[PDB]
Design a protein around this ligand. Structure first.
Ligand SMILES: Nc1ncnc2c1ncn2[C@@H]1O[C@H](COP(=O)(O)OP(=O)(O)OP(=O)(O)O)[C@@H](O)[C@H]1O
Ligand SMILES: Nc1ncnc2c1ncn2[C@@H]1O[C@H](COP(=O)(O)OP(=O)(O)O)[C@@H](O)[C@H]1O
Ligand SMILES: [Mg+2]
Ligand SMILES: [Mg+2]
Ligand SMILES: [Zn+2]
Ligand SMILES: [Zn+2]
Ligand SMILES: [Zn+2]
Ligand SMILES: [Zn+2]
Lengths: 224, 598, 651, 143, 49
């Protein structure tokens, strides 16, 4: 399953400093937790490195439940828990994960580069021929990861006074894909995210930022 | 070394004096206690009453009102120092000032280029609201040519890069990288409002302008609200061309290109740095409030106790004394339809529909409707349109609509693209502005079948689903329908059933709780009574309206009572089954046929 | 000049080079024949001593013998704060014909000279007066261009007067006038005015000498108002095959929002030719220019129309002599008949239709039912003319159309429902979708004449229900939701079923309109043809005499005065008369195939009585007004010729 | 190499994709023939420099090469739209779609409405790592 | 090439070659000037220009 679910109540009860650090800088903390989970699993199972080589930690029962209408710039870069109804869901797309490039001037295969969620990885020179010139994805030596966008809106029962429901995009990666379905009512834990490539710099209006939730844990609300 | 805005600095110090010296009738410094609440997260705006500012320092209020845009950052700095020493705040938490209670109000037509940058209060109707986004207020950049970092460049309602790199022997003006993790943001909301219908000149469509809400005012105005925005009219650079060229801005450095690099064409315009100066008017609102508030006490969820606290002691003693009022049923009926003679049953039914029943959900999942729908069918000039107009003017959250004048997207919901982001904004229609209210559909029988389908969907399942333009969105439509319909042939034939007299589809007719037939009896005594009522109303306009309860009093009372969820007693249950048995029995053989079956 | 600010004039365009050229090898402007000195002195001579020797009326200040007509106007500009002088170009034409020729030919060079001359004269006297800016002259009434299609490229940048109906007015556009800058380094600020339509950015601060550090700060800058107006021209010369013309106007700073859609206006301004870009994002322009008017002046007065709402609301519209004459007319026993007969004088003895139309022009009493929960009461009178053809209904509708301000003419199948209410188009000057009003909103405070009412499908005739009942037009379309104002009077003309009245069918069977729609009209005039030989002879003489050979201004001013000042209120005995009248009329109309009476006909009576009292300048509705309301209501529908069983016969 | 079933719902017109191209230099007119093109939805970046050298003569321009269209080996080329088989879609669920790329004799083997099984290389479009919103690292898939 | 309007397809980088017969040349000499021998300080190398 390559994914370990950690209860936030248990983490806080055992060690409260990590739990208090967790929602303030979850990108770094979840990176650390993934490395430590890999170590503990490989210690327990030596032969599991040829299965996944990456363990994802999903934080559960986070107490910071904010409804979609209440996310602000205060919440940016923080682990939030929200609930809502999945309204749309792309197909599982393959996203570059450890991308190898071809120098299409000398055909050298430029070593694996990590693909962050924030920006396109663009190589500099070719290590061999030192060309800045065009590269291309080596799609045979690249490893990919599963990607899926969902739109989640507030449950119509929650939106109440006479006002419209609010929706956020969420990104499910590599285990979380196909865990939701248009119509599902879910609990979403993720990092409220600001900084990838959407900032409206095109003078098409005010310098506002598009935000997304990097889903970290998805919990449906139903029988199975 | 640095130029200082003398008027702005003076205004800042005077404003800090006002904050830390003005005291209310209790003799205590009120804005100190108010800014004590401001140490919280999600809490960054002090609301300052302008009447207090007027009483404390007339000249400071005049300067703030006249030069609001330029001195507003300094008022915000004054608020930051006021809340800084007194408390322990995050260092980089910005605070905002929201003035309220400006005495004078301006029309939207009076928002000319004279009011630009100075404080004003306008009122409009909120047409639509957009998502809250983080706005970049001042970004820090990186020069891609020399790696210097340009800090805190102010964004002027547009993404502005630095004019020039800080390094003087690097004259970069194009290649910058926004260090987004060092920049600061604000909560931004754009809402579209339009001028209210009592403000329209002759022959004119209502003017719409987009108002900008910031940090804590951001989610205050919802669609359909008649809100009252105070803030500043501002210009925002625009993209509107192909007109005649006009109003350019070019460098004043006298510069001419050499042979092969002549300052002509695209190259010459880029080199002279020419750019069109196109602006549009936007309202930057610091505070939002309803134009006609329901209570005087306060304004997230709604319970009876929350409503009761939300109102003043006088208002709730009024609410209580009518709640204990025997004959309140007749009192409300008379107080709410003062000019209509007769039709006491219709008045009672419409009042009950205003109060509504208790919505419930079964264990399996089906929702049990709790909204009364009322249809008024009757002969010409029997005050059907008058009933609908009475409710529409009385009830907040009431929409009025007629038969063919409405489309289907304009009746339920539309989708338009958010020009600021990837998001999508839903344009609310009549059945959604009337959520938890009344939708008065007039001329119901002449309303298109393709639109009758939308009406029926919202009546039967209290929801509206959108799958258009790139989004699926399910929306709440918990409206109650108050409809008026003409009979076929324009007159009600008493020899036919209700089904044979109106051309409503059977599903629609079934979703109606009450059907009030208003037959025009050609009766001389009722002709006399109606004539006296009409002529008296036209003789003594304001007079001849002696309603036992103020209409605002009823609004408050009804809003309070809607929080109650009555239960059904066991003896009430038995009585209900017995009365239902009687009602069924009125529909058997032998006796005269009824208008519709039970 | 008194140190008073001399505000820029965007209506004159961006300034030109203004080169002075000496014609001797006297000092005219380059390309013109004007020198500023002699033009200034000529205009001063004009202002000081000009008297109209032929005009004596509608001045209300003008002594019209006192040597200046215009320095009386300067005195007014001293009394009121507005720094504008409206100069009739015909006066300049009388005084100095060459100065007039120079004005319409080089307005951009001559009008600023007129401004300097006016301010010199004004601040000679009134030397302690305070004005928010110096006086700006507004020449109007230039030689009317009958057809704006006749204008040539020789006419570009000249002063022209045209007339037409305002169709659409844009939202207010802020035009930059002076830019504000701060240095991003030292916060030193500077200001730069528009010079020939562009701003020269400082490019080096004079304080810290940093290159390109001054930043334009938009909301500290100074702006002016601009507004685009679509005006449908109303040419007096209409050559064969020429379709109607829409002209773009641009109003600035003070003429912004001065006209509303549906207003008929004479606009004086400069004929401008402007280049079109090939795309909005490039600077190439087409060789073929487009044209607009830069509006200098709006003239609302028209001799052949009635006074508009803006005029009637103006307090000094009548001299005391005029008001006394009007009141003396109101004391005449038959002022009602005189005013009715003054309408459509070329139409023969339709005295009751003309009385009804007169009452429609006067209208009932506007009432504020806002505190009654009732809603809005319609004070407008809606007349329906139903009759067999050739009986001059279209002539009456044409007369009312050509007489009122804010009117519309619609006929038959040529109108749609959204073409009467409103619709979205895309303005082809901004590439933006804008909302356009239709015929029923363009007549929001006027009369909409619907001809061939019967030959008009029920789809578009349902739109009329809400307009005729509630004076509003609620539209719930895809994105736009609002309630347009449609406080129109409706003058409708229709034929009977079978297009000719046949006497074997009852009135209801023969009008054939939905019975709920007929109650919206408060007069149904049955224009029936008696097979009468005497009437044939009299009408024949009127019509033939028409082939070989009361004032209007008094009628115009009478109606304007009545609208301004008279607000009739029901008296107690009028109240009782109305009660009895409604009960009786309801007994009468409850017969077989007659047009029945509903509680709405009582309000019809109230409106007619209030209008009739307003004809008397009464301010109090009395039994005579209700009596005439009853009589008019009965004469229309021919209820004396109607038996309670069947149709009618002849009078 | 994947094998998937589905129903074809669109079939583009058969077009011409080059397998070999020849390019000619604008100044010296020398040609760079029989450059092999990658199969599938993959493009080609022309060389930014002429091969021929003659030190006595001056050099050719920066981007001198132009496709010679008559000296090009083109093959047939069709793009299909595969929908998930209607009997394979989960119950409350939108169908999935897949883009297919056919070549040279696989063109016109199917018409829209056919139920097919496909064997092919699950691949991404390689048109140059350009054409930049929300999804980063996402390149369009096809078989 | 500044005239890239007389056709949509473009000219290269650095398209320009000097036209030697269309150039207006003038005469041209270089001189070496030495400090006057009487003006050179006593023990001192002469200056040149
Ligand atoms: N009473 C009258 N007074 C003056 N002119 C008349 C009269 N009756 C008829 N005419 C003349 O006869 C012609 C009638 O045409 P007009 O269009 O006015 O009638 P109409 O009622 O509109 O006809 P239709 O019902 O066919 O539309 C007009 O030219 C009008 O001048
Ligand atoms: N029972 C009544 N009491 C008071 N007014 C009435 C009554 N019946 C009709 N009216 C008057 O008739 C006028 C027209 O009524 P309206 O609301 O247009 O009727 P409908 O739309 O049902 O045909 C209204 O202004 C109303 O004042
Ligand atoms: Mg009605
Ligand atoms: Mg006619
Ligand atoms: Zn290489
Ligand atoms: Zn730099
Ligand atoms: Zn400086
Ligand atoms: Zn070459």
């Amino acid at each position: 399953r390559e994914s370990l679910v950690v209860n936030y109540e248990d983490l806080a009860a055992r060690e409260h400093v990590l739990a208090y650090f967790l929602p303030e800088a979850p990108a770094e903390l979840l990176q650390i937790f993934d490395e430590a989970a890999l170590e503990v699993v490989l210690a327990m199972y030596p032969k599991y490195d040829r299965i996944t080589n990456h363990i994802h930690v999903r934080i559960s029962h986070l107490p910071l439940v904010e409804e979609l209408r209440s996310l602000r710039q205060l919440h940016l870069n923080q682990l939030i828990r929200t609930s809502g109804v999945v309204t749309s869901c792309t197909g599982v797309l393959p996203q570059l994960s450890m991308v190898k490039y071809n120098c299409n001037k000398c055909n050298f295969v430029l070593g694996p580069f990590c693909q962050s969620q924030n920006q396109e990885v663009k190589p500099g020179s070719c290590p061999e021929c030192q060309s800045a010139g065009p590269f291309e994805v080596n799609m045979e030596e690249t490893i990919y990861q599963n990607y899926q966008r969902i739109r989640i809106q507030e449950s119509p029962g929650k939106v109440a006074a006479g006002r419209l429901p609010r929706s956020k995009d969420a990104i499910l990666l590599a285990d979380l894909v196909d865990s939701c379905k248009p119509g599902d009512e879910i609990e979403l834990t993720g990092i409220y995210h600001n900084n990838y490539d959407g900032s409206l710099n095109t003078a098409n209006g005010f310098p506002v930022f598009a935000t997304v939730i990097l889903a970290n844990h998805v919990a449906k609300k139903d029988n199975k | 070394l640095e130029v200082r805005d003398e008027v702005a600095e003076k205004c800042q110090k005077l404003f800090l004096d006002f904050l830390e010296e003005f005291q209310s009738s209790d003799g205590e410094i009120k804005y100190l206690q108010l800014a004590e609440e401001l140490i919280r997260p999600e809490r960054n705006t002090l609301v300052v009453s302008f009447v207090d500012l007027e009483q404390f320092n007339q000249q400071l209020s005049t300067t703030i009102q006249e030069e609001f845009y330029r001195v507003y950052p300094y008022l915000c700095r004054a608020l930051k120092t006021f809340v800084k020493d007194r408390k322990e705040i995050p260092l980089a938490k910005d605070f905002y000032v929201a003035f309220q209670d400006l005495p004078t109000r301006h029309k939207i037509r009076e928002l000319t280029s004279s009011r630009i940058g100075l404080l004003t209060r306008i009122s409009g109707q909120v047409v639509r609201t957009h998502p809250v986004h983080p706005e970049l207020v001042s970004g820090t950049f990186l020069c891609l040519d020399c790696q210097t970092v340009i800090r805190d460049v102010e964004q002027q309602f547009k993404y502005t890069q630095p004019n020039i790199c800080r390094n003087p022997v690097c004259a970069n003006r194009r290649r910058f990288l926004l260090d987004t993790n060092k920049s600061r943001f604000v909560d931004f909301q754009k809402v579209r409002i339009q001028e209210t219908q009592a403000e329209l000149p002759r022959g004119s469509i209502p003017r719409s302008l987009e108002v900008i809400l910031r940090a804590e005012a951001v989610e205050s105005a919802q669609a359909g609200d008649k809100c009252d925005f105070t803030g500043t009219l501002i210009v925002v650079p625009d993209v509107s061309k192909l007109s005649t060229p006009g109003a350019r801005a070019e460098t004043n450095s006298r510069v001419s290109g050499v042979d092969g690099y002549e300052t002509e064409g695209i190259r010459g315009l880029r080199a002279l740095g020419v750019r069109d100066l196109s602006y549009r008017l936007v309202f930057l609102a610091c505070c939002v409030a309803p134009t006609n508030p329901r209570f005087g006490g306060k304004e997230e969820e709604q319970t009876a106790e929350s409503i009761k606290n939300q109102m003043t002691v006088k208002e709730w003693e009024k609410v209580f004394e009518m709640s204990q009022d025997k004959n309140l049923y007749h009192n409300l009926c008379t107080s709410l339809f003062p000019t209509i003679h007769g039709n006491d049953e219709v008045k009672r039914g419409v009042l009950l529909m205003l109060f509504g029943g208790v919505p419930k959900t079964t264990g399996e999942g089906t929702s049990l409707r709790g909204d009364i729908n009322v249809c008024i069918v009757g002969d010409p000039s029997t005050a059907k349109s008058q009933f609908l107009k009475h409710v529409e003017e009385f009830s907040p959250r009431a929409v009025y609509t007629s038969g063919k004048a409405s489309s289907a997207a304009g009746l339920t919901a539309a989708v338009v693209r958010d020009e600021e982001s990837h998001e999508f904004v839903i344009e609310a229609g009549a059945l959604m502005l009337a959520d938890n209210g009344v939708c008065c559909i007039d001329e119901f029988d002449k309303m298109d079948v393709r639109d009758q389908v939308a009406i029926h969907e919202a009546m039967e399942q209290q929801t509206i689903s959108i799958t258009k333009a790139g989004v699926k969105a399910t929306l709440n439509a918990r409206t109650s329908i108050l409809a008026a319909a003409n009979p076929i042939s324009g007159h009600y034939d008493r020899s036919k059933s209700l089904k044979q007299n109106i051309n409503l589809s059977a599903p629609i007719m079934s979703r109606f709780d009450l059907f009030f037939i208003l037959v025009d009896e050609c009766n001389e005594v009722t002709d006399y009574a109606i004539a006296r009522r009409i002529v008296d109303l036209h003789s003594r306009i304001e007079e001849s309206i002696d309603r036992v309860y103020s209409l605002d009093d009823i609004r408050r009372y009804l809003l309070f009572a809607r929080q109650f969820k009555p239960k059904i007693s066991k003896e009430s249950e038995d009585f209900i089954v017995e009365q239902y048995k009687h009602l069924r029995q009125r529909d058997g053989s032998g006796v005269t046929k009824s208008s519709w079956r039970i | 000049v008194r140190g008073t600010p001399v505000r820029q004039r965007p209506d004159l365009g961006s300034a030109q080079k203004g080169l002075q050229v000496d014609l001797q090898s006297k000092l005219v402007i380059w390309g013109t024949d004007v020198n500023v000195a002699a033009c200034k002195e000529n205009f001063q001579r004009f202002l000081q001593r000009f008297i109209d020797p032929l005009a004596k009326e509608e001045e209300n200040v003008g002594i019209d013998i006192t040597e200046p007509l215009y320095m009386q106007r300067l005195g007014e500009i001293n009394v009121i704060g507005e720094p504008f002088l409206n100069v009739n170009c015909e006066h300049i034409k009388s005084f100095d014909k060459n100065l007039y020729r120079q004005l319409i030919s080089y307005p951009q060079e001559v009008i600023p000279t007129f401004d300097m001359a006016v301010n010199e004269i004004f601040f000679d006297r009134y030397p302690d007066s305070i004005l928010e800016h110096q006086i700006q002259v507004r020449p109007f009434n230039a030689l009317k261009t009958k057809n704006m299609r006749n204008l040539n490229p020789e006419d570009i940048d000249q002063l022209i007067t045209i007339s037409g109906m305002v169709i659409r007015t844009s939202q207010l556009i802020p035009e930059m006038q002076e830019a504000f800058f701060q240095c991003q380094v030292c916060a030193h600020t500077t200001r730069v005015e528009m010079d020939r339509g562009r701003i020269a950015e400082p490019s080096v601060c004079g304080r810290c000498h940093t290159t390109h550090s001054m930043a334009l700060i938009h909301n500290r800058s100074l702006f002016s108002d601009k507004q685009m107006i679509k005006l449908q021209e109303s040419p007096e010369d209409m050559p064969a095959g020429q379709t109607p013309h829409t002209v773009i106007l641009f109003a600035h700073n003070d003429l912004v929002d001065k006209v509303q859609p549906g207003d008929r206006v004479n606009v004086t301004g400069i004929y401008r030719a402007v280049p079109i870009r090939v795309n909005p994002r490039v600077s190439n322009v087409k060789s073929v220019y487009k044209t607009h008017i830069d509006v200098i002046h709006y003239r609302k007065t028209d001799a052949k129309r009635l006074h508009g709402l803006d005029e009637e609301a103006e307090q000094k519209l009548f001299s005391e002599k005029r008001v006394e004459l009007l009141k003396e007319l109101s004391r005449k026993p038959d002022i009602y008949e005189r005013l009715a007969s003054a309408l459509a004088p070329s139409i023969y003895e339709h005295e009751d239709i003309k009385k009804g139309i007169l009452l429609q022009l006067f209208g009932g009493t506007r009432k504020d039912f806002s505190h009654t929960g009732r809603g809005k009461f319609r004070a407008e009178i809606n007349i329906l003319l139903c009759g067999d053809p050739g009986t001059s209904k279209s002539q009456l509708l044409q007369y009312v159309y050509n007489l009122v301000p804010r009117g519309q003419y619609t006929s038959g199948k040529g109108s749609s429902a959204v073409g009467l209410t409103a619709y979205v188009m895309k303005d082809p000057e901004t590439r933006q979708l804008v909302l356009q009003t239709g015929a029923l909103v363009l007549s929001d405070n006027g009369i909409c004449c619907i001809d061939e009412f019967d030959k008009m499908n029920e789809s578009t005739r349902s739109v009329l229900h809400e307009v005729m009942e509630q004076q509003t037009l609620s539209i719930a379309k895809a994105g736009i939701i609002c309630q347009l104002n449609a406080r129109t009077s409706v003058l409708a003309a229709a034929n009977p079923i079978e297009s000719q009245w046949n006497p074997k069918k009852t009135t209801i069977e023969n009008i054939q309109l939905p019975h709920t729609l007929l109650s919206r009209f408060d007069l149904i005039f049955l224009l029936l043809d008696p097979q009468d030989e005497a009437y044939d002879r009299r009408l024949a003489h009127h019509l033939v005499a028409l082939y070989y050979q009361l004032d209007m201004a008094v009628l115009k001013d009478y109606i304007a005065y009545a609208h301004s000042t008279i607000m009739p209120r029901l008296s107690e005995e009028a109240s009782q008369a109305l009660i009895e009248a409604y009960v009786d009329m309801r007994k009468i109309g409850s017969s077989r195939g007659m047009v029945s009476a509903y509680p709405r006909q009582l309000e019809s009576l109230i409106r007619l009585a209030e209008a009739h009292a307003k004809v008397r300048l009464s301010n109090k509705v009395e039994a005579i007004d209700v009596e005439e309301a009853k009589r008019l209501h009965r004469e229309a529908l021919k209820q004396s010729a109607t038996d309670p069983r069947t149709g009618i016969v002849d009078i | 190499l994947v094998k998937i079933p589905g129903i074809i719902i669109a079939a583009s017109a058969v077009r011409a994709k080059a397998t070999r191209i020849s390019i000619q230099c604008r100044s010296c007119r020398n040609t760079l023939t029989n450059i092999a093109m990658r199969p599938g939805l993959e493009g080609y970046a022309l060389p930014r420099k002429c091969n021929t050298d003659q030190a006595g003569r001056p050099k050719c321009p920066l981007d001198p090469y132009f496709i010679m269209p008559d000296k090009c080996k083109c093959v047939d080329f069709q793009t299909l739209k595969l929908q998930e088989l209607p009997d394979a879609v989960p119950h409350g669920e939108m169908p999935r779609h897949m883009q297919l790329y056919c070549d040279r004799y696989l063109c016109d083997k199917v018409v829209p409405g056919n139920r097919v099984t496909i064997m092919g290389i699950y691949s991404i479009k390689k048109f140059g790592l350009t054409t930049s919103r929300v999804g980063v690292g996402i390149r369009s898939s096809y078989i």
